[PDB]
Amino acid sequence: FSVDGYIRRAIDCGFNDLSQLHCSYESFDVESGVYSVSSFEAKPSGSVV
Amino acid sequence: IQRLDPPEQDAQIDRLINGRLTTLNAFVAQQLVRSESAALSAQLAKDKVNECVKAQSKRSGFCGQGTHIVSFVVNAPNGLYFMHVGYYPSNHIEVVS
Amino acid sequence: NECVKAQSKRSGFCGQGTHIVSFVVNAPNGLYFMHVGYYPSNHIEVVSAYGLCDAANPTNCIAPVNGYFIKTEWSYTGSSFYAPEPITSLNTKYVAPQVTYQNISTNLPPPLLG
Amino acid sequence: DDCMQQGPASARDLICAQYVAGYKVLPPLMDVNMEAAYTSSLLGSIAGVGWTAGLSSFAAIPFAQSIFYRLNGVGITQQVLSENQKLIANKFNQALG
Amino acid sequence: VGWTAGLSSFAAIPFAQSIFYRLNGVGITQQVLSENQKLIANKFNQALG
Amino acid sequence: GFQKCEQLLREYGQFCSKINQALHGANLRQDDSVRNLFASVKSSQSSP
Amino acid sequence: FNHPIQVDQLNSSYFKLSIPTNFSFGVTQEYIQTTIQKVTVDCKQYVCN
Ligand SMILES: *[C@@H]1O[C@H](CO)[C@@H](O[C@@H]2O[C@H](CO)[C@@H](O[C@@H]3O[C@H](CO)[C@@H](O)[C@H](O[C@H]4O[C@H](CO)[C@@H](O)[C@H](O)[C@@H]4O)[C@@H]3O)[C@H](O)[C@H]2NC(C)=O)[C@H](O)[C@H]1NC(C)=O
Numbered sequence A: 001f002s003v004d005g006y007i008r009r010a011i012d013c014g015f016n017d018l019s020q021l022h023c024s025y026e027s028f029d030v031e032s033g034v035y036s037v038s039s040f041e042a043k044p045s046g047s048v049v
Numbered sequence B: 001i002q003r004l005d006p007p008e009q010d011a012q013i014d015r016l017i018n019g020r021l022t023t024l025n026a027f028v029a030q031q032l033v034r035s036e037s038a039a040l041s042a043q044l045a046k047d048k049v050n051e052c053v054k055a056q057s058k059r060s061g062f063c064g065q066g067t068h069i070v071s072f073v074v075n076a077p078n079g080l081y082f083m084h085v086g087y088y089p090s091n092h093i094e095v096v097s
Numbered sequence C: 001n002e003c004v005k006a007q008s009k010r011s012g013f014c015g016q017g018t019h020i021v022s023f024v025v026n027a028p029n030g031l032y033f034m035h036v037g038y039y040p041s042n043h044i045e046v047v048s049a050y051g052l053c054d055a056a057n058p059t060n061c062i063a064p065v066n067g068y069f070i071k072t073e074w075s076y077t078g079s080s081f082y083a084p085e086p087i088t089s090l091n092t093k094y095v096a097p098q099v100t101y102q103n104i105s106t107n108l109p110p111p112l113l114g
Numbered sequence D: 001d002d003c004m005q006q007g008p009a010s011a012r013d014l015i016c017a018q019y020v021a022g023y024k025v026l027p028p029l030m031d032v033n034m035e036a037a038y039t040s041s042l043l044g045s046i047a048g049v050g051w052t053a054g055l056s057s058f059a060a061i062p063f064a065q066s067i068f069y070r071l072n073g074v075g076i077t078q079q080v081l082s083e084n085q086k087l088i089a090n091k092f093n094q095a096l097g
Numbered sequence E: 001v002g003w004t005a006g007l008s009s010f011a012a013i014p015f016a017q018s019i020f021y022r023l024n025g026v027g028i029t030q031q032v033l034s035e036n037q038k039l040i041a042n043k044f045n046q047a048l049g
Numbered sequence F: 001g002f003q004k005c006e007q008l009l010r011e012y013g014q015f016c017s018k019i020n021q022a023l024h025g026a027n028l029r030q031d032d033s034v035r036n037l038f039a040s041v042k043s044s045q046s047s048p
Numbered sequence G: 001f002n003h004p005i006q007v008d009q010l011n012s013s014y015f016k017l018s019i020p021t022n023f024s025f026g027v028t029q030e031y032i033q034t035t036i037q038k039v040t041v042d043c044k045q046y047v048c049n
């Protein structure tokens, strides 16, 4: 949010792992490093009943 | 238990459980912090006995203040009480060397 | 730095006994120190001097260096192992005279034969 | 039993609380006489341990003799220590007394 | 490394030679170390073995 | 000592096992600390 | 209580020396932990699955 309140820039926090990093620090600029982020989930391919 | 039936009795007992579990976790966390601290401190005591008491130290400020001469040790309620005897100069004068 | 890269003179810092040499290997969550110390045994009691003075020349006195002057007349032994050897200029230092030094008048060691 | 036949010593008696609250204070690893034995044997070792090279031999020398070597070792000459032995002992005694 | 003054020079000397200096430095005389070099090495070896 | 409480306590897992083990370890730590400390104060040789 | 060797003081200008006649080498083993296992947690997955 700019001083005048408009949104000029944003991060989609679920787009990729880099985006998740920015969101977790609530910043567009984070320091260099190696960070753990949410795992890449396995998803169901079907169901058994 | 005497006042309430199970659906509400449960909720009330559960509040007491949460509070007591919290208390015990806090207690344990502190006993672990305090025992870790005491253990480090015990190693300091070990070093002082060897450096201070069983030897004359040449390390300024390690034992007592001033120049170390001799130290003694007695037991204390939760540890050791060190008695460091140092040499304290006074009435300094200036001379040319 | 104290143990492995140096011989330590700090009692109990490294291992027990007198430190000689230490080695290090890795361990699952850290280092494993291997401290080799000197452990004395079979101690005996002997009679020692604080120092020796020439009885004829009372201001000429010696003290042992890293050892003791022992009766056996007087001889020198290293501090960690009893093994009498002659008192020589290599195991003594000249010192100021003291009331506790012995006055020797016969078998004067070479540092006092002046 | 003390907490039953006499009861709590005062308000908030944390020793008697043990049997009520559900906690127990455990005894220390060594009794008092053993700890005293360790520091007593330590006292008797001071003069003869901090004396010369190596940690293997013991010089059973007077405490006073040890002090004078300790003072000489920090820069007080032997002529001074010899003239002042009674003065030094008195100052030491004042420091501990 | 544990041989003389300063941390800047390295004396590439035998381990055994180092041990004898270390023993001499704690109060065992050279006459003793010289007579007992094999005894000393054997005791050292027993300690590690 | 109330059984209803104990029944509800069980749903929090082995809570009490954790409390006891944590303190047991913490208590062993002092016995080890003391044993080590005194082993080092101990003299080899001493005068009476 | 394991008593230390008792060495008497003398009423004289001399002193008693309790000195070794024998020796051995021994090894004090010591372990120093320098690290702990490094762990990260996918907190969102842990809590909500
Ligand atoms: C080996 O020989 C030495 C040298 O003779 C001997 O040590 C000397 O012993 C005498 C006493 O036998 C000391 O002389 C005096 O002793 C009294 C004892 O109370 C002191 O009070 C005296 O001090 C006063 O006088 C001094 C004179 O200058 C003053 O300076 C001082 O401030 C006091 O006013 C005095 O010490 C003598 O000093 C010592 N010598 C040394 C170097 O200390 C030694 O005992 C003999 N060895 C053995 C085992 O017998």
Ligand SMILES: *[C@@H]1O[C@H](CO)[C@@H](O)[C@H](O)[C@H]1NC(C)=O
Binding pocket: G011, G012
């Ligand atoms: C022996 O010890 C007593 C203890 O008071 C002392 O007064 C006496 O002078 C001592 N004798 C010697 C030779 O030191």
Ligand SMILES: *[C@@H]1O[C@H](CO)[C@@H](O)[C@H](O)[C@H]1NC(C)=O
Binding pocket: C042, G021, G022, G023
């Ligand atoms: C030193 O102790 C060992 C222990 O067995 C013994 O075999 C050896 O003979 C001893 N040496 C002396 C000089 O007593």
